[PDB]
């Protein structure tokens, strides 16, 4: 288990040194999106929550194909705004319900230390 807490203020610095292998050790879901919403990373933990096979969704558009239930002003709206503005740090509850049992979750989104990469952290509530 990779000892990193959900909601840590310096999470993006800590996660900068993790490979996909290390990323699977987190106690929470972690997805890495590019500026266009394509999945660059998607760890085992999130997969436990959504049922998705991590290595299968990589390279696919999240908002378009993986998780259409996040295609809303309440989720997709903030991401694109964050991307545009060049910064993002927001926390809010949500419910994933596409092709799965409705699961109330907490979502944390924040720009990565990298230029055009963005994190989506997910935990059960
Ligand atoms: C809403 O988000 C529904 C499903 C879903 C699919 C994939 C991932 O990663 C999260 C949620």
Curated annotation (Swiss-Prot):
Keywords assigned: Chromophore, Photoreceptor protein, Receptor, Sensory transduction
Residue(s) carrying S-(4-hydroxycinnamyl)cysteine: 69
PROSITE patterns reported in the protein's UniProt record: PAS
GO biological process: phototransduction; regulation of DNA-templated transcription
Post-translational modification: The 4-hydroxycinnamic acid (p-coumaric acid) chromophore is covalently bound via a thioester linkage.
Protein name as annotated: Photoactive yellow protein
Species for this entry: Halorhodospira halophila (Ectothiorhodospira halophila)
Function recorded in the entry: Photoactive blue light protein. Probably functions as a photoreceptor for a negative phototaxis response.
Protein family (similarity comment): Belongs to the photoactive yellow protein family.
